[PDB]
Amino acid sequence: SMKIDVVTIFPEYLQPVRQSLPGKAIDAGLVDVAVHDLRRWTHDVHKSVDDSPYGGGPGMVMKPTVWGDALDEICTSETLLVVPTPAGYPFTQETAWQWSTEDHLVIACGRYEGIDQRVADDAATRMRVREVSIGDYVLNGGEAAALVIIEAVLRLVPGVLGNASLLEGPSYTRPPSWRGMDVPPVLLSGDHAKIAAWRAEQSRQRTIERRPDLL
Amino acid sequence: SMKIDVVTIFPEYLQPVRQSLPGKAIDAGLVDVAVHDLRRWTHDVHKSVDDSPYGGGPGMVMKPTVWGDALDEICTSETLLVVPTPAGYPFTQETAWQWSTEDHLVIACGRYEGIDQRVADDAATRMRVREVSIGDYVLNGGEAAALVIIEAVLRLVPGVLSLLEGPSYTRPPSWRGMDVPPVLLSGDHAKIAAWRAEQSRQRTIERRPDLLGFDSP
């Protein structure tokens, strides 16, 4: 049973991942994904969510008073607060496995210029906070990263998304010949020990070529 | 302007592209994003896009015939074909800068255990092909990765326009008993720059020591 709350100024961004949960998992109460418009917690008629950065510079910083109120309402002592940011610790498959057994994830989506750091710092005094980056690139905001994180975590929770080192090598299916290219004959050989060795060599070669950092 | 075509068996999952940054780029006419249902290029009644692997293994592999017909229709020799996959070359900030200059991206979204390798091999005889990983984690399909790639690229396109950024702050100067660092309120540009540079380098060695050439945790 996992609850995920997402807070964002673009709640529509998260709607297709909500309609991505098998009804069987929701009815079994294994998962609940709720999305919240951050502007619900604004104070002013203009519904302001950001303000100019102290110390000067470009862009805007998200307001601590707004985020503080939102997290106060949404989070509990059991919450793992996830903050996607290009300045975060790396989000990896290990992270995904760890978070897959959490009871309550709250994902705070902000612009990449940032949420006022006092929000995370305050939250960390009463819950666990994880500022994470999904890769070495900048996105305008955390929403697309939230989708990646939700998917990577929930596909590891038994029966939730409906699904059941070295890089994986190439895969093939019918037909055996297509546009002048044949499926590697070893795969049709019925020698399953040899197929495993062939796949291992394919994996080695691909990892050397594409991800030498992994060796 | 730029054209982005996305091919997927879940066209609805790509609707977030209409939000925020990509949505604004589209409304400004700086990019045209078109999403295509792969099943459009099937012919059987069941609209099958997958089949079991040769050589054994779990799951299903996407059929080359359907993909070949789709890419035939959508791609030209000038196309940059993007295939998101955990087995890909890393997608980085540099990649995003490079692709921001392209006339035409086609993003082929796979599911299950991926796409028959001959699809990319065949395409590479006509156009440039890039199989890329957005990070070291596994997803159920390439759709969310397509959204990440589109976001990272579009914010760099003309018309929209190392180290970790340190903490940022805004009003009020004191909140819940936590104060904004005094230097940031001091108006001393030089001291502010120096503090920010230091905060950047300190956050980097704590969170991303690899960026400064040190061992990772």
Provide the total of helices (H) and of strands (E) in chain B, helices listed first. Answer: 6, 9
CATH 1.10.1270.20 residue ranges for chain A: 165-215
**Cβ proximity of A24 and A159 under 8 Å:** yes
**Quick one: B1-161 is in which CATH superfamily?**
SPOUT methyltransferase, trefoil knot domain (3.40.1280.10)
- Å resolution of this model? 1.6
The shares of helix, strand and coil residues in chain A, as percent rounded to the nearest 5, are: 35, 20, 40
Question: Residue A90 forms beta bridges with which residues?
Answer: A133
**Chain B environment of A13 (Cβ under 8 Å):** 16, 19-20
Chain A and chain B share a number of CB contacts under 8 A equal to 240
Residue A65 CB-density burial (10 A; 0-12 exposed, 13-18 middle, 19+ buried): buried
CB–CB of B122 and A181 under 8 A? Answer: yes
The rounded Cα A155 to chain-centroid distance in angstroms is 11
The helix (run of H) or strand (run of E) holding residue A99 is: helix A93-99
The neighbour count for residue A212, using CB atoms within 10 Å, is 8
The helix (run of H) or strand (run of E) holding residue B106 is: strand B104-108
The neighbour count for residue B18, using CB atoms within 10 Å, is 15
Picking from B60, B118, B200 by the largest number of A CB atoms within 10 A of its own CB, the best residue to mutate is B118
Smallest Cα distance from B71 to chain A, Å? 14
Closest residue to A172, CB basis, from B19, B116, B185: B116
The rounded Cα B130 to chain-centroid distance in angstroms is 12
Closest residue to B61, CB basis, from A173, A178, A192: A173
Question: Residue A61 forms beta bridges with which residues?
Answer: A51
Query: If you compute the radius of gyration of chain A from its CA atoms, what whole number of angstroms results?
Result: 22
- The residue in chain B having the minimum alpha-carbon distance to the alpha carbon of residue A179 is B122
**Cβ proximity of B87 and B133 under 8 Å:** yes
* H helix intervals, B11-113: 20-27, 64-74, 93-99
The neighbour count for residue B207, using CB atoms within 10 Å, is 19
CATH number of A1-164: 3.40.1280.10
Close Cβ partners of A135 (under 8 Å, ≥ 6 residues apart): B90, B91, B92, B134, B135, B148
**Cβ proximity of B8 and B16 under 8 Å:** no
Strand A31-37 relative to strand A61-62, pairing: unpaired
Dist. CA A26–CA A146, nearest whole Å: 20
DSSP A122: H
**Chain B environment of A211 (Cβ under 8 Å):** 89-90
Amino acid sitting at position B5? D
CATH 3.40.1280.10 residue ranges for chain A: 1-164
Dist. CA B14–CA B23, nearest whole Å: 12
Dist. CA B91–CA B95, nearest whole Å: 6
Close Cβ partners of B30 (under 8 Å, ≥ 6 residues apart): B1, B2, B154, B157, B159, B160
Dist. CA A123–CA A75, nearest whole Å: 9
Closest residue to B54, CB basis, from A141, A164, A187: A187
Dist. CA A118–CA B180, nearest whole Å: 8
CB–CB of B96 and A161 under 8 A? Answer: no
- As given in the structure block, the two tokens for residue B126 are 């006509």
CATH 3.40.1280.10 residue ranges for chain B: 1-161
The neighbour count for residue B140, using CB atoms within 10 Å, is 17
DSSP B91: P
Biggest alpha carbon distance in chain A?
71
- As given in the structure block, the two tokens for residue A73 are 């309402």
Question: Residue A33 forms beta bridges with which residues?
Answer: A4
Dist. CA B134–CA B83, nearest whole Å: 11
Dist. CA A35–CA B61, nearest whole Å: 33
Helix (H, G, I), strand (E, B) or coil at B5: strand
Dist. CA B133–CA B91, nearest whole Å: 6
Taking alpha carbons only, the member of B172, B169, B162 closest to residue B200 is: B162
CATH 1.10.1270.20 residue ranges for chain B: 162-217
DSSP A166: -
**Cβ proximity of A138 and A5 under 8 Å:** no
Task: Specify the residue for token string 């495993």.
Answer: A196
CATH number of B162-217: 1.10.1270.20
Helix (H, G, I), strand (E, B) or coil at A17: helix
**Cβ proximity of B44 and B34 under 8 Å:** no
Question: Residue A8 forms beta bridges with which residues?
Answer: A37
Closest residue to B19, CB basis, from A10, A90, A131: A10
Question: Residue A128 forms beta bridges with which residues?
Answer: A80
Residue A24 CB-density burial (10 A; 0-12 exposed, 13-18 middle, 19+ buried): exposed
The helix (run of H) or strand (run of E) holding residue A181 is: strand A181-182
Strand A80-90 relative to strand B50-51, pairing: unpaired
- As given in the structure block, the two tokens for residue A171 are 């895969």
Helix (H, G, I), strand (E, B) or coil at A7: strand
**Cβ proximity of B37 and B9 under 8 Å:** yes
CA distances, A178 to each of A175, B48, B117 (Å): 6, 17, 11
Smallest Cα distance from B70 to chain A, Å? 14
CA distances, B190 to each of B91, B194, B199, B203 (Å): 35, 6, 14, 20
Q: Note the CATH architecture for domain A165-215.
A: Orthogonal Bundle (1.10)
Dist. CA A161–CA B139, nearest whole Å: 11
Question: Residue B2 forms beta bridges with which residues?
Answer: B31
CB–CB of A52 and B147 under 8 A? Answer: no
